[PDB]
């Protein structure tokens, strides 16, 4: 009856493992062992940003690398000016229980979402001089954990109903639904060519989806706990995940296996955010131990420590120019570092 | 600094003033989370004061209550329960007519209570415990393995309170406020008032260094 299914599944998963072990001719560390190390990155705070009265759960930079949007629990989406510490906009949210916010590449819209199961799209560059609610996207059963913009009319959302979604903004309808995860999906990252995207979930799994045909192109399984953060390499061929098991792991798409791990014995707390530098050499990860760590992505070394928050670091962001790193935490402050 | 930069800074100062004025108003409010079950009576309690998250606001004796219910979440609790780390109190609804009704209602109630009362986020947060179906326990009869007590009224509910208070580990820092619900009168919210008052003093003493 159902005997054939489990046997066939474990057999072809075992041959997937056999092919993966055959393609592991060496490791990243052996090739990168003759690189001069980066050293110590003593990046210091340049701006501190006050005005949030509750804890910050998300931020996202701009393409222009000067504006940034931040979401807090006080029902506030604040659009800042990094250079002058000027509040460009303050958007009151209909629901204060938000975990994600996004900034469109065109600079015309921002996105927000959280426990209300609705992705809200707000319009900035409009008449009447005020930010207005342009779109409400509903159809997810779980909370909205991450959202990223493709274009002014396409968005991608990750939710805690084991699914991802691709929405058309103008019609407000589910263009594509990405299914296959077993646990709740926490993070999301689009490739630079906007054709593929990786998504990390609570089944200790990352999944590479193709946007066009809506098919799970790849599945990577190395972690032991819930994956909370995921980020693409600037190349678009590799990606990096952070989980609750106090480890970051770097995977390749073409090699279809894990490349590197980033861990230390004195860190036992999870990872809330992950990001890369402009060249991808420096992997910045926000931890629960009130600090952000800066690993060398090729050598698995703790290159630097950003220690300026007296609460849980919740969100990270690196500019498209690569000039600065903004860090937001649970102590109602977010800081620019360079 | 240019003229338009000066005007932008002035707008930023106005936004700071508006943010402070909103922060004071959100600081005078009180946030409580309903965390019982759909088979417990969460919806009946909120409606007796007069899909997605639901959040109700009502003011009782110069105290605005922000009552949040998260019963429509079919996801892992550990990934969003940290969003309620600094709530004032937890309201937990339990149906007394659940041992002989739909399967494992009482076991689910005690399991959820042991999950929440012993949670790392709610280590000092007091729990307001409502026991529903007060008029239905008197007609339902425990008769269903370790009771060893008689099967009349005015003691089974005491046994249920003892069972729920026995799950309270790490005492001398938090208090369980138990109350049989009366669906006719307003004594539900008064108790919610009084318990919250007992929270604020218990906070205020710490804020004045006396405790």
């Amino acid at each position, epitope marked *: 009856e159902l005997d054939q299914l489990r046997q066939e599944a474990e057999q072809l998963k075992n041959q997937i493992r056999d092919a993966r072990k055959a393609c592991a001719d060496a490791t990243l560390s052996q090739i990168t062992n003759n690189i001069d190390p980066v050293g110590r990155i003593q990046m210091r705070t340049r701006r501190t940003l006050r005005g949030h009265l509750a804890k910050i759960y998300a931020m996202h930079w701009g393409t222009d690398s000067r504006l940034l949007v931040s979401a807090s629990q006080d029902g506030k989406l604040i659009i800042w*000016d990094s250079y002058t510490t000027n509040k460009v906009h303050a958007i009151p949210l209909r629901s204060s229980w938000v975990m994600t916010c996004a900034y469109a590449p065109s600079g015309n819209y921002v996105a927000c979402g959280g426990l209300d199961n609705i992705c809200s799209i707000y319009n900035l560059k409009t008449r009447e*001089g*005020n930010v207005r609610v342009s779109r409400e996207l509903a159809g997810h059963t779980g909370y909205l954990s991450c959202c990223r913009f493709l274009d002014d009319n396409q968005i991608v959302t990750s939710s805690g109903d084991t699914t991802c979604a691709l929405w058309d903004i103008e019609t407000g309808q589910q263009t594509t639904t990405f299914t296959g995860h077993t646990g709740d999906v926490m993070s999301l990252s689009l490739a630079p060519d906007t054709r593929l995207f990786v998504s990390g979930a609570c089944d200790a799994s990352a999944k590479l989806w193709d946007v066009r045909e809506g098919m799970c192109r790849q599945t990577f399984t190395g972690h032991e706990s819930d994956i909370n953060a995921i980020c693409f390499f600037p190349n678009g061929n590799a990606f990096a995940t952070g989980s609750d098991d106090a480890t970051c792991r770097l995977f390749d798409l073409r090699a279809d296996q894990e490349l590197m791990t980033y861990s230390h014995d004195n860190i036992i707390c999870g990872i809330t955010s992950v990001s890369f530098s402009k060249s991808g050499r420096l992997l910045l990860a926000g931890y629960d131990d009130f600090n952000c760590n800066v690993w060398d992505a090729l050598k698995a070394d703790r290159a630097g420590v950003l220690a300026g928050h007296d609460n849980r670091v919740s969100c990270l962001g690196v500019t498209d120019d690569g000039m600065a790193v903004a860090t937001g935490s649970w102590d109602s402050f977010l800081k620019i570092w360079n | 600094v*240019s003229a338009e930069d000066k005007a932008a800074a002035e707008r930023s100062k106005m936004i700071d003033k508006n943010l402070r004025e909103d922060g004071e108003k959100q600081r005078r409010e009180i946030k409580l989370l309903l965390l019982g079950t759909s088979n417990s009576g969460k919806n009946t309690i909120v409606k007796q004061m007069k899909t997605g998250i639901v959040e109700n606001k009502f003011t009782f004796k110069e105290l605005t209550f922000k009552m949040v219910d998260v019963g429509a979440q079919r996801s892992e609790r550990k990934k969003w329960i940290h969003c309620f780390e600094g709530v004032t109190a937890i309201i937990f609804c339990v149906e007394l007519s659940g041992y002989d009704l739909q399967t494992s209602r009482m076991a689910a109630s005690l399991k959820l209570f042991d999950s929440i009362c012993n949670n790392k986020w709610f280590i000092d947060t007091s729990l307001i415990l409502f026991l529903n179906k007060k008029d239905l326990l008197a007609e339902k009869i425990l008769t269903i393995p370790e009771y060893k007590g008689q099967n009349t009224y005015e003691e089974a509910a005491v046994y249920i309170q003892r069972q729920f208070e026995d799950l309270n580990r790490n005492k001398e820092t938090k208090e369980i406020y138990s109350h049989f619900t009366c669906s006719t009168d307003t004594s539900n919210i008064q108790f919610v008032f009084d318990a919250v008052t007992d929270v604020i003093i218990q906070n205020n003493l710490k804020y004045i260094g006396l405790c």
Partner: single-chain antibody
Amino acid sequence: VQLVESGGGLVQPGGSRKLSCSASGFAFSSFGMHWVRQAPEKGLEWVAYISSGSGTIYYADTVKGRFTISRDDPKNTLFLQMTSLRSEDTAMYYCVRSIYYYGSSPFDFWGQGTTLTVSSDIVMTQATSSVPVPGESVSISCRSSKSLLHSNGNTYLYWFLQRPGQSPQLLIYRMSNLASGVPDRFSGSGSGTAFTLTISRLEAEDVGVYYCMQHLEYPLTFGAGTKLEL
């Protein structure tokens, strides 16, 4: 978006007059507000400015001590008191909304003005006053007295077009950026003290007077204007 200005009329010299402007269709309290007048056969002239929240109030040198600018945001109205009116105050007054943040477009909307018949600064020089023009390309030059390039890399020049019988409308803000509702055939380019506006493939609704305005420091100064004719 509507800015309807009333109160103007004929007044004998040595009097007082109350101009008003009702604002609708936009969030009035978020905008700084400006009064700019134009003499009957001459160019534009900045008069007064009030900030959002009535925090900053600025006047021109020829109206200080006798002009007052105020606002009420619940009533969505802007007010200008004038006292001891001279014969040099005979002008049409325009009420202008302007907002200031990063990437904003100030002086974007101009009201329908009202008439009043009373009977160190940077110099913007627009030397040409009549350029005949069709489907051709035209260029309009403006010049400065001091450089308009601030230390933040932002060149503080604005270009307005006044069609015949119509209030001026914003073409170019900050010397290069093209405003909303404006065709892409307009281009603004300039360096320190020297600026130009290029219109490729001139068509209808291009006839008018073109004004260059600086915004480094109050008082804001216009050029004389350049007229394009068929």
